[PDB]
Design goal:
Four copies of one chain form a homotetramer. The first copy, chain A, has six helices and twelve strands. With 295 residues, chain A is α+β, with helices and mostly antiparallel strands. In chain A, the strands form three sheets. In chain A, strands 1-2-3-6-7-8-9-12 form an eight-stranded antiparallel β-sheet. The longest helix of chain A has 21 residues. Chains in contact: A-B, A-C, A-D, B-C, B-D, C-D. Strand 1 of chain A pairs antiparallel with strand 11 of chain B, so a sheet runs across the interface. The structure holds 8-azaxanthine (AZA) (4 copies). One 8-azaxanthine (AZA) sits at the interface of chains D and A. Chains A, B, C, D: Its EC number is 1.7.3.3. Chains A, B, C, D: Pathway: Purine metabolism; urate degradation; (S)-allantoin from urate: step 1/3. Chains A, B, C, D: It catalyses: urate + O2 + H2O = 5-hydroxyisourate + H2O2. Chains A, B, C, D: Its main location: other.
């Protein structure tokens, strides 16, 4: 037997950082959960009990806090790139670092219509994420994403004209509820290293905001022919607005809400045009994915 | 042996309802999870296998959907009261109904600065809840609550002057992070029945909004001496603003964020006035409760 | 306004303890999650920002570890009683301690048919719990429980003869699946204090084992007329076998498995006597409770 | 823009099946959660709103139940292969099916030392899983796994001799607790189609049992130099015992249990040789992975 692939590191490292503006008294907080996995010439720790090649996972944890102390933690694309680069530059035998960051929402509170200087609310479970792969000699690959964005529209979704055969019971519909939890990822063109990532810093927050905006607007405005058709429209627009993105991927559950026939009870009408009360279904759910790139 | 207490019913009944304004085209959605438990002269189903006294839990589920079809589902205090009253009026041998409702957020989307007619976002995991106990001959007892409201302030929290003995290692502090998930309940004066609940309908949404507002403002503005002191200020204000509330209860975790001493690393300063990077602690957590009533 | 009730302390305190037999080399591990809440003359911490009455929750955490170091942690009824007693004896102004303990399973591994001296498996998510209320002048009240015991029987459950009216669609059945997650609590007679709890130490593990055994055997062997009828049989037996128990409470979800009619597909028969494939339902679920005491 | 990759289908399909032996009266239950995703010539559903190419996800759900009715559901490697093959044979334009199955434990109860004919216990949250990729013209690729197997050993784990630099605070140790949740995957050699999978049916359960056995025994008996070294020993043995496996992958969290220094309290000794009470850490955790193949 031989080691074909190996990676190790620290997961679930929770980190908070505060910035205090001394002039204005305004404080801004950031909270993230970080995972760093390393690869390199470490096979002997597996095969020979040779711990000399192991940067202890406890040390990786320390490094994350130290790096957060000495560097900006926003945008997460930049922080992840700094963190990953550190390991390949510091340790000769480490040749790749994989950094995953989940950013948690702390939204400044408005109190009596004014932004509060130091109070925050978790206004959603939506996350902004990054995956950064720093590979020696091969640059920096960054995938940015939003996830946990949960939406519903109560009309202007249709689903008809699908394949019908002896396995099919689903009725065609011209008016249904559509609800999903959005997971969208945009993959950046490869960057040559930290200098290039730094040069593009303003684009990261802007592109996240654009991806969010396009997702929400398209969802709300599309008279949807299917999840497939609507998600394609989203991806197309994002690629159009940011030339440094190579691909956009969406992964969308179709969270079903079923009509409830109540006609057995005193002829009560609650289906089709008369449908008012529905049963949200916890499972099963459709799952629809697509990756869209450039011609 | 004898049956001392017994209750049974249906839990986790998910319900969605849509209202469609035909004039304006605006749609409004409500989604809830409902539990109904009944009590009454049902001992024989336990002791004698006498199912004749059992309103099947499946029938309770049907009843919830039928009631939602025929009645407004908002405010939840009203819907729960209608639902509970139904069971004690319909079944001679059922003498109490306990209705718990969790309302899920579907907040109307703003698209290009205008409210969308039929698109919604789950903008938080915060819930609005009710517990309604309808007891034959004893009226309707309603407890309203908000839960899952997660907040953090990065300064203007202190904790000093506590008991110090041989079990104590905690240092006094004049500047710390304070973060919690708010669970607040207000208990209404007993209502004589549905007519009285109906007479107070406008107060329910108003009081929920006030409780939320007071909670957030007090949290943000109090230079907090402790969780205990700050929560008392909240409860006091709520009781002052709504005379039909008898008691207010808060249950608050203290979600700790610890300083990280980095001085071992190149004399790096990250404690006290120099603290920037903190380690959020998943557990353990302080838990502080109080129930405040009228003099 | 006035403080009507107040309690505070530390939740989610994870604790592990190892016992090492030096003669045999056998090691035994215990892992628990502990919550301790205190009550007493502490109103002024809420109303006057008087922290002098507060035993810091951090100190409560320290106390739990210290107590675990100096005392046996099994049975949990004993440990909880020691822990609760500590607070009321140590602090003059603390008059009640509430201790909740969840014991996690670490079952010794059998390797090649022999018990391993120091290796363990979490063989189930089932818990053994205690709630101990130590109230000055009023003794020690202990409720013991098991929870998270998940079972299913594929036949020998019936449900017929229930009330049928215009809300009823459920068909009577003489053969169904029955599945539940068992939550069972037995409440001990009040104990005068620690000496009395110590005097009964052997009964605690024995009664837990008996409660588990009776639950499983009754479930497996009863040709069940309903959840209500079967659970009553369990409670009756437990009360019969341990005279120091005053009440037994069961809380049982009915986790439904629905038949799937496949007759639309090539006349496939999958209902009634021909039912083989079923759809487990995540929600809603029946919820059935009962508390059984002595005549 | 162009569609680079697309797949869609149904997730979270819960399925139960019962087998009833009419001779012996013994019943055996199987419960699984199934996901099926399809790929093929479906781009136009995304780009042109052409639903004619879509096998509705609701139909996929129906197909799963129908297939479970007409075929054995065990071993899951066989069922997944039947299910995947169905879609590529039935639909000309579908060229790949991806089937993921999670098997849930229903272990027969022993009552009074004898196996019960129809009563079952969920004796662990451990799962047995399969991922089956059926690709037209390319055969059937099967990855089998166990997950959620949670173990702890209280001694006979060491960790010393790792890299020490200015980021390192971790002390070397010759005696620590080791605990993990095992996720292990074995990948089968490619099979040419269903006939070949059928020919190997007995190997599937046998190899799962062997993988479990080797994992547990190695964990219990290895005087572990590190997670890396111990996991390599497991993978090596599995590859040795089943020649039709090409690779074995382990992914293991290191679930840390920290010593608690109690010396501040009356000189209490609870570290090193005197360590009895530990603090299990919920996060962060080490994460160690490796994939082992043949020379
Ligand atoms: O077994 C271990 N492997 C590691 O890589 C490691 N790093 N810190 N502690 C550790 N333990
Ligand atoms: O055992 C049962 N008890 C009940 O009360 C019930 N109601 N519907 N099905 C049921 N099954
Ligand atoms: O606000 C607080 N209240 C308390 O009771 C406490 N105990 N430790 N830290 C604390 N903070
Ligand atoms: O939007 C949808 N896409 C699908 O593929 C599908 N299948 N069933 N319902 C559906 N809705």
């Amino acid at each position: 037997s031989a080691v074909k692939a190996a990676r190790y590191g620290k997961d679930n490292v929770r980190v908070y950082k505060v910035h205090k503006d001394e002039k204005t008294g305004v404080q801004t907080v950031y909270e993230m959960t970080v995972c760093v996995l390393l690869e390199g010439e470490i096979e002997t720790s597996y095969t020979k009990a040779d711990n000399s090649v192991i940067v202890a996972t406890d040390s990786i944890k320390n490094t994350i806090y130290i790096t957060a102390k000495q560097n900006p933690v926003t945008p997460p694309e930049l922080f992840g790139s700094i963190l990953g680069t550190h390991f390949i530059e510091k340790y000769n035998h480490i040749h790749a670092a994989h950094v995953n960051i989940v950013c948690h929402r702390w939204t400044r509170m408005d109190i009596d219509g004014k932004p509060h200087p130091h109070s925050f609310i978790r206004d959603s479970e939506e996350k902004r994420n990054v995956q950064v792969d720093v590979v020696e000699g091969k640059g920096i690959d960054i995938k940015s994403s939003l996830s946990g964005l949960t939406v519903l529209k109560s009309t202007n979704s249709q689903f008809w004209g699908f394949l019908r055969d002896e396995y099919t019971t689903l009725k065609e519909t011209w008016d249904r509820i559509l609800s999903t939890d959005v997971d969208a990822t945009w993959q950046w063109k490869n960057f040559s290293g930290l200098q290039e990532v730094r040069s593009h810093v303003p684009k990261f927050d802007a592109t996240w905001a654009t991806a969010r905006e396009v997702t929400l607007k398209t969802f709300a405005e599309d008279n949807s022919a299917s999840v497939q058709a609507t998600m394609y429209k989203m991806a197309e627009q994002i690629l159009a607005r940011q030339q440094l993105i190579e691909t956009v991927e969406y992964s969308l559950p179709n969270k079903h809400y079923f009509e409830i026939d109540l006609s057995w009870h005193k002829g009560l009408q609650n289906t089709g045009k008369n449908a008012e009360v529905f049963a949200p279904q916890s499972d099963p759910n459709g799952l629809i994915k697509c990756t869209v790139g450039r011609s």
